[PDB]
Amino acid sequence: DLDLAKASATDQLKKAKAEAQVIIEQANKRRSQILDEAKAEAEQERTKIVAQ
Amino acid sequence: DLDLAKASATDQLKKAKAEAQVIIEQANKRRSQILDEAKAEAEQERTKIVAQ
Fold it and tell me: How many other CB atoms sit within 10 Å of the CB of residue A49?
């Protein structure tokens, strides 16, 4: 057990490091989607305000 | 060893959960700003064409 205890601790920490980082990565991908959609909405609004 | 590794991963996971918020809740005020800047852009554009 003295061996497999550290085995499981290390293999747990690995998974933590992996999926926390995918959380943070997806947060910024979601950002990018939101910000570029905001670009599109901005242009669309300008198109109306000028024609007005 | 296992207890310590689990606590250490646990705090990192808290930080992942919090920064998934920080990123997109910044991205949201920026989504707002990107379009509310376009409001000013097109309003000044309209006013300029009308003045001309």
Answer: 16
**Residue B12: exposure state from Cβ atoms within 10 A (0-12, 13-18, ≥19):** middle
Residue A20 is given by DSSP the state H
Q: List the structure tokens of B49.
A: 């064409």
> Mind telling me how many Å the CA of B43 is from chain A's nearest CA?
7
Q: Which of A9, A4, A1 is nearest to B8 (CA)?
A: A9
B34, A38 in Cβ contact below 8 A? yes
Mutate to test the interface with B, among A10, A14, A35, A47 (most CBs of B within 10 A): A35
Which residue's entry shows tokens 């950002």? A31
Q: Please give the torsion angle defined by the CA atoms of residues B25, B28, B33 and B34, in that order, rounded to the nearest 10 degrees.
A: 130
Q: Return the residue of A nearest to B33 by Cα.
A: A38
- Resolution (angstroms) equals 3.3
- Residue written as token pair 């991205």: B27
